[PDB]
Amino acid sequence: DALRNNILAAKTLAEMLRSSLGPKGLDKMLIDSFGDVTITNDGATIVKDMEIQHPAAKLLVEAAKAQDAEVGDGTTSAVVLAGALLEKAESLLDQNIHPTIIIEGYKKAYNKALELLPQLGTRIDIKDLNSSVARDTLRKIAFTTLASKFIAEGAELNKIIDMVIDAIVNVAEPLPNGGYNVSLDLIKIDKKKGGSIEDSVLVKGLVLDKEVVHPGMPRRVTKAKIAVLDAAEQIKAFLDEESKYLKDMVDKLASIGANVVICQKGIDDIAQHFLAKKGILAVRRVKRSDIEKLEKALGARIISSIKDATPEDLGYAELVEERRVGNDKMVFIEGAKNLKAVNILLRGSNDMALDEAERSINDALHALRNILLEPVILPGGGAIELELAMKLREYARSVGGKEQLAIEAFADALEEIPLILAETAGLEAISSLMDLRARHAKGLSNTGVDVIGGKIVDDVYALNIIEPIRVKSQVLKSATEAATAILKIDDLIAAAP
Amino acid sequence: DALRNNILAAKTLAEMLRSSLGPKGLDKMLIDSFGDVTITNDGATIVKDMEIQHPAAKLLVEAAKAQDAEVGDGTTSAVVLAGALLEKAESLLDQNIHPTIIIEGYKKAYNKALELLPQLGTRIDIKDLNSSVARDTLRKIAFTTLASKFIAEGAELNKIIDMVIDAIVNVAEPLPNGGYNVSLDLIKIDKKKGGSIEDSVLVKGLVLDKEVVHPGMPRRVTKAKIAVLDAAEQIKAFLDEESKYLKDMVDKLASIGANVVICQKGIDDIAQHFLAKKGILAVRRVKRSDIEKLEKALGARIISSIKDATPEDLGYAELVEERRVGNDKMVFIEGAKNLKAVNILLRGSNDMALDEAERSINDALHALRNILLEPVILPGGGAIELELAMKLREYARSVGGKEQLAIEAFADALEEIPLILAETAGLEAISSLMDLRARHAKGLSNTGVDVIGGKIVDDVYALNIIEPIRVKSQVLKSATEAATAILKIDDLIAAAP
Amino acid sequence: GKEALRANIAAVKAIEEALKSTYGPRGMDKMLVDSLGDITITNDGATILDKMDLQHPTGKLLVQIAKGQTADGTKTAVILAGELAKKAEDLLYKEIHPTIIVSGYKKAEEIALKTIQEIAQPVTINDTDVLRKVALTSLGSKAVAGAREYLADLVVKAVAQVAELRGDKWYVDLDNVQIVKKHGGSVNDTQLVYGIVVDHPGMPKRIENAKIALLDAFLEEEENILKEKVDKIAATGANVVICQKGIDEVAQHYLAKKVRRAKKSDLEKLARATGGRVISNIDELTSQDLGYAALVEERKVGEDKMVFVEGAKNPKSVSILIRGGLERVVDETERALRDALGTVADVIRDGRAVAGGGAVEIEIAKRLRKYAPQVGGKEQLAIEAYANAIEGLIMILAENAGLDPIDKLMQLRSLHENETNKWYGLNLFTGNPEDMWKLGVIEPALVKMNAVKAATEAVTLVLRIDDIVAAG
Amino acid sequence: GKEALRANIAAVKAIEEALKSTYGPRGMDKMLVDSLGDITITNDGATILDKMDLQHPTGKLLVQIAKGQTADGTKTAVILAGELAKKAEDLLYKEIHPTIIVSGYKKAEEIALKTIQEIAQPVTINDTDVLRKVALTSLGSKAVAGAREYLADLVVKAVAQVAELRGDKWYVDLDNVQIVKKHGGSVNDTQLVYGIVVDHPGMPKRIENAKIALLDAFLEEEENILKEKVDKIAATGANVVICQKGIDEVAQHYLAKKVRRAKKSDLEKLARATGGRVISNIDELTSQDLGYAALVEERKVGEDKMVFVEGAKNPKSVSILIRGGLERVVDETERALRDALGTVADVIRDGRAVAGGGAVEIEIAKRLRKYAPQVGGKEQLAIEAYANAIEGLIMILAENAGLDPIDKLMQLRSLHENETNKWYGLNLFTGNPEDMWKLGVIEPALVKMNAVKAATEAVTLVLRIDDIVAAG
Numbered sequence A, B: 001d002a003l004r005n006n007i008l009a010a011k012t013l014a015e016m017l018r019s020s021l022g023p024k025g026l027d028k029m030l031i032d033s034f035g036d037v038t039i040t041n042d043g044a045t046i047v048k049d050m051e052i053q054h055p056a057a058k059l060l061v062e063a064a065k066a067q068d069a070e071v072g073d074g075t076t077s078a079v080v081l082a083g084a085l086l087e088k089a090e091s092l093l094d095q096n097i098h099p100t101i102i103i104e105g106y107k108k109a110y111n112k113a114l115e116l117l118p119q120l121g122t123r124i125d126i127k128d129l130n131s132s133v134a135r136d137t138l139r140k141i142a143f144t145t146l147a148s149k150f151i152a153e154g155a156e157l158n159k160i161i162d163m164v165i166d167a168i169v170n171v172a173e174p175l176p177n178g179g180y181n182v183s184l185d186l187i188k189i190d191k192k193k194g195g196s197i198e199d200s201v202l203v204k205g206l207v208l209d210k211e212v213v214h215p216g217m218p219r220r221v222t223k224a225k226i227a228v229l230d231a232a233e234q235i236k237a238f239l240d241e242e243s244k245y246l247k248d249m250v251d252k253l254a255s256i257g258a259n260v261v262i263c264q265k266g267i268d269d270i271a272q273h274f275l276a277k278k279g280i281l282a283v284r285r286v287k288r289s290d291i292e293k294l295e296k297a298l299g300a301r302i303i304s305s306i307k308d309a310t311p312e313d314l315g316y317a318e319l320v321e322e323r324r325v326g327n328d329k330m331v332f333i334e335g336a337k338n339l340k341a342v343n344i345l346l347r348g349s350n351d352m353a354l355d356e357a358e359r360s361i362n363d364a365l366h367a368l369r370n371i372l373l374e375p376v377i378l379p380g381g382g383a384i385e386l387e388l389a390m391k392l393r394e395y396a397r398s399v400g401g402k403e404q405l406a407i408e409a410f411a412d413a414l415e416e417i418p419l420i421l422a423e424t425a426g427l428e429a430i431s432s433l434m435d436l437r438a439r440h441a442k443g444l445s446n447t448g449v450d451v452i453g454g455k456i457v458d459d460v461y462a463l464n465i466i467e468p469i470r471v472k473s474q475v476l477k478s479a480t481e482a483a484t485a486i487l488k489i490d491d492l493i494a495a496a497p
Numbered sequence C, D: 001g002k003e004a005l006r007a008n009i010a011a012v013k014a015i016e017e018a019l020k021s022t023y024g025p026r027g028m029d030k031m032l033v034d035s036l037g038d039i040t041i042t043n044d045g046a047t048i049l050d051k052m053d054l055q056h057p058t059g060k061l062l063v064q065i066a067k068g069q070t071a072d073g074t075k076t077a078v079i080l081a082g083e084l085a086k087k088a089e090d091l092l093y094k095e096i097h098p099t100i101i102v103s104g105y106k107k108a109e110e111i112a113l114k115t116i117q118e119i120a121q122p123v124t125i126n127d128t129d130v131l132r133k134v135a136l137t138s139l140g141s142k143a144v145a146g147a148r149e150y151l152a153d154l155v156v157k158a159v160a161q162v163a164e165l166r167g168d169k170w171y172v173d174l175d176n177v178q179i180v181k182k183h184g185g186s187v188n189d190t191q192l193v194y195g196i197v198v199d200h201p202g203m204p205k206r207i208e209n210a211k212i213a214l215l216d217a218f219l220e221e222e223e224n225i226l227k228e229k230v231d232k233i234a235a236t237g238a239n240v241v242i243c244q245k246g247i248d249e250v251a252q253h254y255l256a257k258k259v260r261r262a263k264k265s266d267l268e269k270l271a272r273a274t275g276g277r278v279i280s281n282i283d284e285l286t287s288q289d290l291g292y293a294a295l296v297e298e299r300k301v302g303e304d305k306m307v308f309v310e311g312a313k314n315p316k317s318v319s320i321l322i323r324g325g326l327e328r329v330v331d332e333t334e335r336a337l338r339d340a341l342g343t344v345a346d347v348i349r350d351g352r353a354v355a356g357g358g359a360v361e362i363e364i365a366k367r368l369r370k371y372a373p374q375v376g377g378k379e380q381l382a383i384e385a386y387a388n389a390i391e392g393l394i395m396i397l398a399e400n401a402g403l404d405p406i407d408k409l410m411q412l413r414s415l416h417e418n419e420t421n422k423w424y425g426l427n428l429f430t431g432n433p434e435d436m437w438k439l440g441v442i443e444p445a446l447v448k449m450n451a452v453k454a455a456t457e458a459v460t461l462v463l464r465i466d467d468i469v470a471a472g
């Protein structure tokens, strides 16, 4: 009875996030008690910020928070599932089946499903971008994540995808599972205001400056860079040598062996001409926050005074180029020392499209990271759930006792994802599921639900509906843990703090 | 307000018969207050036997009863429609549109629809059965009516249809509309127990007797028939002439000029031999109720005594034949005098299949009669309603004022028939209608709903879904009259008997 | 009109609950209470449904349906219909139109009947062990005071007489079985008689080649009339005279110088057995309406006189005397014996038998689950639900025996994966699953089929009706 | 979670009902009641929504939405959103998922914006009659005491100044318009001034080529400090000094030997017009932060002193003095004038105008009905509903004029079958349909578009939200 109350608590909580599932996930409005509001269909945000009431529900929240902590993508999917499990459990309680039995059944079912996940997983090819196999995969998954959230034109999108791909080329790899570990710390997204999205560009760093003097060298093959802080009693007075000074400064800079000079305070025409004579690439003044970032990568040091300077402070980069970027000339720096992150110049014509593009790239990167960590894809749109359900019924048959009903009840819960996920698309929650079962049991395991298009698809891979295994297994895990923990609790007891 | 109450009364009544519509019409259970019950999905039976409560509803019942009186097929269709009209009217009342306006609008819409019915009607060919055009039509409509109510095998059904066709050949015709007036008084259905349905047979009369004596004539081309009542103080005693008597009786019968003798009391072997010598067709004894029927058609008279007999009492028939009918020999009589009705020998292996076959033939005959009276067919399955709705919206556009909304509201009511009719088949009441609209406005007017198969059909004529115009127009009429009469009533007043 | 449908389903569920615990060979008894205060304790379901205080139209209807075509099987039909109704409800909550559920159930019914027809083991009148088993099957749980293997004998012996083969099938005219009862001793004193039995110094006793007068029908003038009436009968050569209406003792004296029975249900079978016919008015009486009885007589039941019509012409004649202590005993004996006669009669007339214990049921479910995915979406669910509703019977059967339903269901389900365990059912006394055929748990296939059929019909009727209306 | 959605729809419908009758050029006034007891009588919808006692989150949200990008148009957006919400409700009862209704409405929005873009009549700053008409459009129903054709003049004259063309579009920096008010006489005493206006014997008055100090910012020690502060300012060469904080009269004496304003909304536009900039702390004050004003001065309003900054450097400078009797008059005048300025500004900056009277509306509906069947089933209904919801505006507009809604709707619908009546709308005073363009019932296309856009956004937001949750 108290158990049933807990079950109802968790269930009623799950009922709310039932609608926030998938692409067409309805919105939820969070009222920040401070007198503010934030609305979203995001599981994490909702579950986090919301002030939950009932303990069981709070525990479900806890499970969800863990689910988010382990990985970002799937959070709601876990809660809805947990709710489904409990809802299917309460039907077995009415069959007078002790909770512990149901729990064990669910454990076994979970283990079997967990075992079956890879069996039903389509492994991918990550052997280089030379081949373009990876690109096609990355394109599919890109569009998978991008399609739901973009209203932008496809041509603009394609460029963004091209950028993300170009990014992924550079990012690191762990060997053991033949997968790739995309360190998001190795990606910059500089939001430049003004210009079209197609003007956006990727490179290992750039200062967004124009060549100070056209006579000045606009391209240097083998480069050497210097960072200058100062623009070119016991009394100290400057010797009466005005231009000779400047010339000597430039000659010292040339003597150190530098080909590029990025002055902090900016360069005067005389210095420009001297630099132009020596064939040095001059750059206008830059922000302190910018130069400070540059020197550490470039392995250089901000020179306070050129008289005291030394080649120790001399940096280096593989290539530097004054490139055109949407009729806006900019200095690009390539492959210098510690490359670290790849820098995106994001040309947004408006703050909205700017933040939108940034958001898109971020989501795409996160998803691609999640799939890359574990290089096996699953047929989304609820297909894999149905497949698992079939396999789990088949597996349930070979188990006896009340546990045969517990496992079968685990399967009936999975099938709530296809049901709900389609329902969001306004399709009949029932006929869709039986149609799916028909198409599935008598066809490919890839039969699923396209929520965007709002239709049942015979093969969801063809519609570029893909789900990582790393997420799915974790969702399954945390969901099972949650529903278990709820079912395992007998009743409540008054305590003393 | 009182008007709204009346509207609600009629509406609530119509709500019940909403489900009893079409083939899949759900059942309604009538409790005969005497302590008895009868269940049915029939409009007439329900509306009739039910003891209605509210006056408005009673008036709707009255309208329905009239609708049934004029023609049998459509009764519920009128009530549901009326309900729809009132329901669509109450929405215009909320638009603050005076009832009289709505009434006029509905009148105009009705007149236009009534005008459009023939325009959208597919006239048929009734020029003889030599051609088989009529048969194909009759086959389609046969299957239209038969399909919903038969669970029997098609091969058995085909024979029944063949019989009905063979019947219709013989039945009368009115000239003015180039149609046929099937007088159901010109059809007999004799329910013979024992034998298969395929053994059933049609003929202009038959006595179901075997040839009394095999030597006796089993076939007579040019026949002459006699009906015999008696089998072959002031004191009266029979002269001692035993066999000579019989022989003389037979000779008298032969002298009159008869070729067939159907004795009421049966014939003895001696008489049989004499008859066999004279070459007369002898028939065993028959029931009084049977012979009485025979003599009036046959233009003969039941002879009390052959000594006093005369050729005035002599009947006649075109042909008589001892025919085999399911390994059961029977005397068939063909085309005698006043042919009147065509006689069916209905061979039922069981009382159920017997009454079922009879029922089938009856319904088929009634429907075929209804379509034959007015030789124009309409696309059933709700197609014609949708077509009318389209045309009536088009027509409504060219009318102004509040009446443009009254007519449009007449159209919205018609479309409730497709909606409801599909809903009975478990299809979504909404998507089906819009799908129909799409298929209809952009395609043939024959697009409708197959309730049996439970699917939307691009052309319902191809699925043999046909509706007579005679019924439809009347339904439209009585429905309009009803909804009108309801809307026209302002309020209730207490009276004195 | 869901509101009208739910009430029907509730009614069906109510009647199910009424007859639920009576089910099985360990079925508990129900105590019927008349408004008078008098009572009737019984296991038999038909009897309950008869004497039961019916409330709902759909109820009385359901009862009217379950009793149609064999006394037993009603139990099964009712409970099955109840289960089907409940599962239908479960399906209805999922927003599935009734016309779909009906169709599904119909398909399921067809597959079920196919299944029973397929499984069925053909039997003959010669396989008497089967007849005995089938008899004993229904007799279990009747609370009859012993002599089951003797009452079963009487049944087997009874049906044997009432049987003659015109063609392929013996015409077991069950209606020729007379059934009476008296108190004293026990059911071991129960006994058959070839002829019909019926419970002044009068006319002579031992009539050989007896002609039997079967007749359902100022003071001095009345005396003359009555004597006229008697003489009319005397003038037809009637050895023994039977009546239903009250006879004036003067006419008894007259006839004595030349019984009034009580029930026509006896006179009926008397007319059946003797070959004579009943007459409404003695003015029409002849000598051919008199029945032939080769050796009529009378005998003393321990506490009462009783009439015996031995040597009746017709071969298919038989009667049984029931004996016992309390009323409940003799009554339950009567009803039980009726059930037995029914089952055995159907076995003979049909010629097929199956195993009880719910073997056929789990087989049917097993089949339905296989056939279910082969049809459409929404129907599949209905069929599956049908299967579950069938399994419900096994579960309830387990419940009534004090066993865990689900465990035994799962056990049997697991066992019935083998082709070679298609007979395995639930041994309620043992508690474990066992081959129900060897244990003599056998029943007529026709009974099962009919139960399924009637239950299906009932539930479909419940689902087809949308609303209830008062007519005139 | 329908229960949470219906409440939202109810909230939207409530706010619609709140602003409904204010709509149109015969819009009634609403009486706002503060809890203090004080009141505010007004027609302007924005003002209402501002001072209104908002209850629901969705409400405050809706208000927040309708006021986003132009004071007027809010009315339209709100009421439209209300209609859309009601029709959405009507669609919801038909069991249509919100994500469908949303999509439909979005399509309808697109077609609507296409329609407005298509119909729109291009205009220029030179077509002053249009500017006048557009001004007068919103001014109708304001209950302003006459001088509409004069206030409109002031508007047309006002926007003309604040306008300079860098490229294709004039940069009408509307924020340079100062607005003050005083009592006395009537609105015929209203009057423009090129420079900004702001409501001891002190420093000199007529300063030619004036440098303007813009500054938002034991007793003997404090005196020394304050005098230091004054001298600091004096040492920068400031002709006239402006402050916001309270100034000690001693500093007024000092400065007099060398006003404190009240609002920064004035100091803002002063900083805008003079070319100078405000300083938070006078320690940072220089000579370049001083604003240039070619001929500053002061004048007497009939009842009060008032400050005038004439000859401000910036070309785009302008201010208006409002005059009248009661507070409601001058306030309604202010708000009305704001509305006018907004509309005209948008006409100039956008360069397109359409006819009021609901012409654009019935055109949009007319278009939507044509486009509706070209898309899917359930969306078509949503689009149609959208069209109806748009027509609702014409109907309500008819209601607020004391006319029969439906009749006039039907009339206009009938009229708009002709390509040549695409401007025809409803003459509320006349009562009959008429070409709204000749009658000077003209409005900025951008306003209509924005109203549609914001209403659509609001309703979709209402429909997208499934439930409301308390967070932290």
Ligand SMILES: Nc1ncnc2c1ncn2[C@@H]1O[C@H](COP(=O)(O)OP(=O)(O)O)[C@@H](O)[C@H]1O
Pocket (backbone or CB within 6 Å): C022, C023, C024, C025, C027, C072, C073, C075, C076, C137, C138, C139, C140, C339, C355, C356, C357, C358, C359, C425, C426, C427, C428, C436, C440, C441
């Ligand atoms: N000896 C037995 N062992 C197992 N099941 C039995 C036995 N006898 C009867 N049954 C079961 O009981 C059911 C019928 O019970 P019920 O109708 O209550 O009694 P009756 O058979 O007397 O009508 C059948 O389904 C059959 O399987």
Ligand SMILES: Nc1ncnc2c1ncn2[C@@H]1O[C@H](COP(=O)(O)OP(=O)(O)O)[C@@H](O)[C@H]1O
Pocket (backbone or CB within 6 Å): D022, D023, D024, D025, D027, D072, D073, D075, D076, D137, D138, D139, D140, D339, D355, D356, D357, D358, D359, D425, D426, D427, D428, D436, D440, D441
């Ligand atoms: N003179 C007029 N004749 C007809 N309609 C008008 C007139 N002036 C304004 N309208 C209508 O009023 C609506 C705007 O009203 P409202 O927002 O209440 O006032 P304002 O225009 O001052 O904001 C527009 O849809 C427009 O069609």
